[model samples]
Target: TYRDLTKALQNPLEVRVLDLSRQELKTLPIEIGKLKNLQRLYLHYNQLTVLPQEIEQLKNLQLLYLRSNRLTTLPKEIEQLKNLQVLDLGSNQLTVLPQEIGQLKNLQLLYLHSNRLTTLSKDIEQLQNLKSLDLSNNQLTTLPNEIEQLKNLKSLYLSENQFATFPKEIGQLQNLKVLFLNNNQITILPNEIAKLKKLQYLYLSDNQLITLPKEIEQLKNLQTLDLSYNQLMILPKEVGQLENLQTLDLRNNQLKTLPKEIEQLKNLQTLFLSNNQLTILPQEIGKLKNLLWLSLVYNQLTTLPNEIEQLKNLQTLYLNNNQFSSQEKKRIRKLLPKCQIYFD
Candidate 1:
C-alpha cells in the first residue's frame, strides 16, 4: 500500500484527499501543486520544517491539518486556499501566523494550541465566520480585542496559558455558548461578561478568583459552571439565580456555608463540595429535588440538616473525611436508605 502512494503522487491532479501524516517527510513534494482538485490534506506527525510555495496551487483545499510538525510559520501563499474551512496547527513550533490567513473568509474552525505564540495579529478579527477557536496551552498574555468580531463563535477555549486578566472583549460574542478559561492566573472577571446571555457552559477552575461579581446572575442560560480550585471564601447569593444550572463544581474553596439562595437551582443535578470549609449546609438544600450526586468529602461539617432526606432522586453521596458522629451516620442512613453513602 505504501508503494502505491509513490505511484499515486506521480498523478497529483487525480488525488482529492491525501493523508501523509507520520510519513516522516521533511518536505512536501512540489509535484503536489498539480492537485488542483485536492480538498483535504493531513500532514501531521511529519518532519516538515516548511511548506512548499507550490501549495498555493491547491485552490480547492477545504481542510488542512499540520499538527505535531516542526513548522515555525506558514507560507503567505497559503492565503490562496479560498475554500479552506478547518485548520489544525496544534502541537507545532509556530510563533506567528501569517496575516494573509485573514483572507480565508470561509474558515469555520481553527486549532492553534500547544505552541509558542505570544500574540495574534489584529487581522484575526477578520474571521467573521469562525465558529470555534482553541488557543490553549500557549504562552499568550493577551488576545486581540477585535476577536469580538467573531459574532458566530460558539465555543472559545483559552485555558492553560499565561492570562493574568480576563479577555473582556469576549463578552461581545453574544452567540458563545461554551467558554473555557480554566488553568490560568485570572483573579477577576469583568462585568461586561454578563452580555453573553446565551452562554451555557463556563469553566473557570484552577484560577485565583476570590469572589464573583453580582452581574454573574445575568447568565440565565448557564447549565454548567466549574469554579473549583480557587481562593473563593464566599459565593455571591446571585449564583442561585442560575435556575437552569445542572452541574456546579465548587471543590477546594474556602467557603464556610452556602447561601439559602442555592435552593433556587431547581434543575441542579450534581454538586461538588469536596475539600471546602463548609461547616453546615442551608436547610434550603433539601429543596433540590433533582440532585443525583453530592460530594462533601474532606469538609468540617459535624452534622447535616434532616431536610437532606428530601433528595428523593439522590443516588450517590460521598461524605468521607467529614466530622460527623456515629449517631449522626445512623440518622443519615435512615434518611437515604436507597442511596449509596460513603463515610470514613
Candidate 2:
C-alpha cells in the first residue's frame, strides 16, 4: 500500500485511519506532515497530482476524501485544516480555488464535483459554517459575489454547469432549501428569485429559459418545480400564486397556452405539460380540483375541453402525442372515466 504509506509515516503521532485508496499514488507524501492524529483521510482512487504542503500539518484532520484524483490544485495549505469537516474534492482537475479558501471556518460538506472550476472565490463567502455545497460537473461561469456569505447554506448543487445566467445573488440564501440549476446555459431568472423564502426544491431543468418572472409568484414556500427543458413561451399569470405548489413541471416548453390563472392551483398535485404548443386547455382546466398527475404529451391538441368533464380529482391522463381523432379519443373517454387515460 504505497509502502504502507511510508511505514504509516513512521508512527506520525500514532496515525489515525488514513486509507490510501487505490494507491497508484502520484503525489502527496511530503512526509504527509508526519500525521499528527489524522482523523480520517482517504486518498480515493489516487494518482493524486498534488496536495502536500506537508498535508497542512494534520492538526486533527477531519474527514477529507480526495475523490478520483488528479487534482490540479488546492494546497494553499488547505486553510490549515483546523478540523476540516467533510471535504471531498470530486473527480478533479480543478481549475481554481484558494482565495485562501476563506479559511474553512468549520466547513460542513464541500464536494467539488467533476471539476475544472471556472470561478468561485469571493472567498467562498467565508464558508460561514457551510452546509452541503457541491459544484456539480463544473466549468462554472460565475458565482462569487461573496456567495451570499453562506449563511448556513443548505444543499446547493449547480448541476452540470456552464451557467449563462441566473445568480441574482441566489436571492441571498435565507437558508436555501435545495436548489440545483440543472444543465445550464440559463437564459434568465432573477426577479431576485422571489427572495428564496426558504425555497423548497427548485431545479430549472435543462435551461435556456424564456419567461417566468412574475417574480415566480414569490415562491410562497414552493414545493418541487422543475421546468423541464426550457424555452418557455408563457406561464406567469403570477403562476396562480403558488400556494405551496406541489410538483409542476412544464416539460419541454414552448407552451402555447395555459394561464387562466391555472385554475388557481388549489395545492396542485403533479401537472406536467409534455412537449408543448398546446392548442387549448383552460376551460379553467376543470379548476384543477387538486389534479393528480396530468400530462398532455406532445400537444397541438385537436380537442378535449367539455370542461374536461370537471376533473373531479383526476388521477393521471396523458394524451400522448396529440392531434386527437377517432372522434377525439371517444370524446376523451367519455370525458375521463375517473381518469387514467393515455394514448399514443
Candidate 3:
C-alpha cells in the first residue's frame, strides 16, 4: 500500500505496530502524535530530515529506530518518551544530541554508531538504566569523565574511533564484561584499566601502542586478549600472572624476544608471534605444557633451539618466511613431528 490517508486518529490509541522503513518518505504525518499507545516505531532507511515536535505525545513508545537517516539532531521534546527502552540512530548525519537525552530513565540499549558526533554531554551519566551502549565509528576523541556513572552497563563497543589514549573513565565500569576498543590512535592504556576485574574479552588491536603497563597482570579474570598490529617492542614481565589466560595474540610487533618469565603462564594454549623481528625464542618456552598453537612466521630467525623437541603438546607450528635451509628444515621436522609445521 503506497502512502494513503488515515486521518481520524485519537489520543491514547492502542496502535502497537508501525512500519515506515525504506519508505522513501521524507517526513512523518503530523497525525503520528495521536498514537499514545504506540510501542514500536521503525523509521530506518528513510529520508527523514528531522522529527516533528509533536512526536513527544507518544509517551508509551518503547522502541524507535531512526538509523540511516538525514537527521542532525532530535527534538528536545523527545524527552517525553518516558517508557522508551531502545533507541538506534546509527549511520546518520547527527553532529550533536539534545542534553535532555539523559532523561530516558528506562532506556536499556542505545546505538549512536557511525555518526559525526564529536562529544557527549556529561548528563549522559544520568541514564542509570542503560545496559548496553554502542558509539563505534564516530569522531569522538575523548569520553566524558561522568561515563563512570553507568554502573549497569555490561557491553560497550567503542572501536574505530579517534581516541589518542585510553579514557580513564573506562575503569569505572565495574560490571563491564566485554569491551571492544580496536582500531584507534591510542598510544597508551591507563593503569586504571586493571580495575576491570570482570573483563573477559578485550580487543586492542590496530593501534599505535608501543608498550603495555606492568600492571596488566592485575586482570586476574582475563581470558582472551588481542594485541595484534601494534608497535610493541616488549611485553611486561608481569604478563605471566594471568592465571586464567587461554589465548594471547602478539602478531605484528617489533619484539625481538619474549620475557623468560613467560614460562610461568602454565595455562596458555595459543600464542601468535608472526610478522615480528624475533631472532630467538626463550629456551624456557618449552615449559608451556598446554600450548597447542604456536606461530613464528616472517621473523629474522636462522635457527631454532634444540629445546623445540620438548613442545610435546604443540599441534600446529608456523615457521615460514625465515632463512632456514633445507638441512635445517629436515632437522626441525625430526624435532617436532607431532606438530604440523609450515615453511616458506
Candidate 4:
C-alpha cells in the first residue's frame, strides 16, 4: 500500500504493493527495479509514455495496472515476468503488442481493450493459462487462428470492433462461457458457433445479422441471448432448442411473425419483441409458464389470442401502438387482472 516512490525503493524487499496512480508522474524511476519483492504495481492515470526495461526485475509481480496511460508500446523485457497473472493495459495508446507478451505463462487475465489496435499477435496462443481476454473497442477486423489454443478461456469481450464476419476460430474455444460480439458489422453467424457447447451468455446486439444459423440450437446451455437491433425478418425454429434460455431479446428487428417453436422455451422469463412487424399472436404463447415480462410494442397486432390468459406468472405486458379496439383492450385487461398492461 505504499504510495511514496522514494520510501518504496528504500525498503525494496518490504515493498509488496505500490500505488503511484494519478501522481502526474511523467517517468518511472529506473530505481524501481530494486523492488524485487513487489507483487502488485499500480501506475494508472499518469503521463507515462514508456516503461523502463528495469520493470522486468519485479519477478514477484502478479498484478500490474497501467490503465489510462500514454504508453505506445511495451518493453520486450516484459517477457521476464513469469509470475505475472493479471495485466491491465486498457485505455492506452498501444497499437501493437510485443510477441514477448505471450511468454507470460502464468497470466490468467489480460486487458487490452480501448486501444487503437488494428491487429493482434499470433503468439497469443502461448498464453495457455488465460481465462479472460478483453479486446473490445479496438479496430480489429480479424483474430489470430491460434486463439483456439486458449483452452481455458471463459470470457471474451470483443464488442465495438471492425469484424465483418464471425471469426470461426473463436468457436473452437470449447471452454468459453460469455461472449460479447455486439456493435460490429457481422451479417451472418457461422455454423461453427455450434461448437461452443458450453456458451451461456451471448451478446450480439447492434450488428447487421439478418438471420442466424440453425446450428445455434446446439448450445443447449445458453441462458441469455441478446439479438436486438439487427435486421432479422425471421428466426430459425431451432432457437427453441435452447431449453435453458431465460432471457431472450429480439427487439428492433423486422420480424413479421415468431416461430411457433418459441413455445418450447419453457424456462424463458423475459422476452423483448418490440419494434417489429407482428400482426398476430401465437396461441402457443400460453405454454411459457415461467415468463414474467413480455414486450410487443410498436407492432401491427390487432388482437390477442385467448390462450394469453394462461400466463398466470406474467407480471407486465407491453402492447402499445397496435390496432387493438377499445373493447379488445377491456377484454385483454379482464383476461389478466393481475398484470400491468402498457397500451400507450
Using lDDT as the measure, the top candidate is 4
lDDT (tens digit, per residue) of candidate 1 on 156-212: 989999999988788889999999998999998778778999999999999999989
What TM-score would every model get versus the actual structure? 0.97, 0.35, 0.91, 0.98
Which predicted model would earn the best TM-score? 4
Residue-wise lDDT of candidate 4 within 221-260, one digit each (tens)? 9999999999999999999889999999999999998788
What's the lDDT for all of these models? 0.90, 0.85, 0.86, 0.93
| Candidate 3 Cα misplacement greater than 4 A, ranges | 1-14
Q: In angstroms, how far off is 334's CA in candidate 3?
A: 2.2
lDDT by residue (tens digit), candidate 2, 1-344: 12367778767777788788887888876877777787888999978888878777887888889999888888788888878888899998989887777897898998998988888777888788888899999888778778888877988999998889887777888888899989998988878888888888899899989888888888888888998999989887997888888889988889889989988888888888899899998799888788888998988999977997888788889888899998889878988898889887
Candidate 4 backbone collisions, by pair: none
- Tell me each candidate's RMSD, in Å, in order: 1.4, 14.8, 2.8, 1.0
Stretches of candidate 2 off by over 4 Å are 1-53, 56-80, 83-90, 93-105, 115-128, 135-152, 158-174, 181-197, 204-218, 221-226, 230-239, 243-259, 262-275, 281-344
Tens-digit lDDT track of model 3 for 45-113: 989989999889888889998989988899998899889999999999889978879989898999998
Off by over 4 Å in 1: 1-5
